[PDB]
Design a protein around this nucleic acid. Structure first.
Length: 437
RNA sequence: GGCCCGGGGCGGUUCGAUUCCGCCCUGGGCCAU
């Protein structure tokens, strides 16, 4: 029931069991055979090759080494060729460049093409660096794999384990580097409590210093930041999580938090107790990869939020959600309605020129002098958040992300009230408002 | 696709805009895959 003890039972949650490993070995086996009966120059990398793969997330990554001189196209053509001839099933996939995805003896496999190079510089694609990361990482991680797993388990369980844009957390490489630095999960957690947004971790120099931003410098590339895509808040959440784990160790930290739905009737009551405005902007999901959708949703949500605050509606928090069919931009505002008149600051009284122009615009309610300068009452074109957003989205759709914006321009609607709790956005909303229970 | 930095034109808004809201082309850097 204490630190160690818990970490004991925890392994049971993060370490792949015999049959899962056996499935993987036999798959690795076959794969190696097929690549040889064709005699290609390949190298297995990633967590499978270093036995740092988290339980239930088996996936083999085979990198195909190609001569420097080979043209970009040759790598991909031949890359696809090899993948097809060795994979039971094959489905081309994309990233920096196209690669191949499939299955062998029932396990996931990624066949990527890269340049067999020497020494970190000369790296052409990002994937060209992976081979190095593997070299640098294999000798050093040995005998600590289970540590890399506890860490991956911890993060994954609190939704901060991926480094892709839909998570902005810790990548698997970052995780090992951490273990290779602190020595184990417990040490990583223990020290993480003292981490700050100005913390720099230089693996290669075994040093920790103060920088301008959280920076884990790549053993292979001193300029590169491995935690480049880790959000300031996710950084913060982890530091807070580690502080709690040490405070009250628990096996719960390794268990995926239960979905915990809420009846739409309880949610309506809560919004009533909060007396706020709760609405969402719905639109068709652009058929694009997640790495493109979310950075866009984030922006879209940001722009409308910012429109909301300068517009005086006192937004409290924003939030977004994507489904197979639509995307929802959720908001909560302190102001359900606002007067139609508002005051506009004008020039200082002794500026005859500007004052004259200021008083030249005919308005309905006659400007006045207050504390040295002129003011005018003006009228709003809208008086509720929803009204304003309907106005904003219609005219600034183009500012919400290339794709998200093209979708909103063609179709969008604002939901709220009962009709909104029907939508598949209750968790995000509960998450947004800190609903607890 | 998104973020950062920087140029050249514009639009709207405003008494007043390089300085708010945005659109054109445009240069470098970074991120996820």
């Amino acid at each position: 029931m204490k630190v160690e003890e818990i970490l004991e039972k925890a392994l049971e949650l993060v370490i792949p069991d015999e049959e899962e490993v056996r499935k993987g070995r036999e798959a690795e086996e076959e794969l190696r055979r097929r690549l040889d009966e064709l005699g290609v120059e390949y190298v297995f990398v990633g967590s499978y090759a270093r036995n740092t793969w988290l339980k239930g997330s088996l996936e083999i990554d085979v990198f195909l080494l190609f001569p420097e001189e080979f043209s970009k196209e040759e790598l991909r053509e031949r890359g696809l060729e090899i993948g097809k001839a060795v994979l039971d099933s094959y489905e081309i996939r994309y990233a920096e460049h196209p690669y191949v995805h499939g299955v062998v003896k029932g396990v996931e496999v990624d066949v990527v093409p890269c340049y067999k190079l020497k020494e970190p510089k000369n790296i052409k694609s990002a994937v060209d660096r992976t081979p190095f990361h593997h070299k640098w990482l294999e000798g050093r991680i040995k005998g600590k794999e289970n540590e890399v797993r506890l860490l991956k388990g911890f993060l994954k369980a609190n939704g901060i384990y991926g480094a892709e844009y839909k998570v902005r957390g810790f990548s698997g490489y970052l995780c090992e580097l951490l273990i290779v630095f602190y020595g184990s999960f417990l040490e990583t957690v223990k020290n993480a409590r003292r981490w700050t947004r100005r913390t720099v971790i230089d693996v290669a120099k075994g040093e920790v210093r103060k920088g301008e931003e959280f920076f884990v410098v790549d053993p292979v590339d001193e300029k590169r930041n491995v935690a480049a895509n880790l959000s300031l808040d996710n950084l913060a959440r982890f530091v807070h999580l580690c502080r709690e784990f040490m405070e009250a160790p628990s096996l719960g930290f390794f268990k995926p938090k239960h979905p915990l739905e809420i009846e739409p009737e309880r949610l309506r009551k809560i919004v009533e107790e909060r007396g706020t405005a709760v609405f969402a902007v719905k639109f068709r999901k652009p058929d694009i990869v997640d790495d493109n959708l979310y950075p866009q949703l984030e922006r879209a949500s940001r722009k409308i939020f910012e429109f909301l605050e300068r517009e005086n509606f006192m937004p409290l928090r924003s939030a977004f959600k994507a489904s197979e069919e639509f995307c929802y931009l959720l908001f909560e505002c302190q102001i359900k309605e606002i007067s139609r008149v508002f005051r506009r600051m004008g020039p200082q009284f002794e500026d005859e020129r500007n004052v004259k122009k200021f008083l030249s615009r005919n308005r309905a309610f006659r400007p006045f002098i207050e504390n040295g300068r002129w003011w005018a009452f003006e009228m709003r074109k809208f008086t509720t958040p929803e009204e304003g957003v309907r106005s904003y989205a219609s005219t600034h759709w183009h500012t919400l992300g290339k794709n998200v914006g093209e979708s909103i321009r063609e179709y969008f609607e604002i939901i709220s009230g009962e009709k909104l709790f029907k939508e598949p956005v209750t968790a995000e909303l509960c998450e947004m408002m800190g609903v607890k229970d």
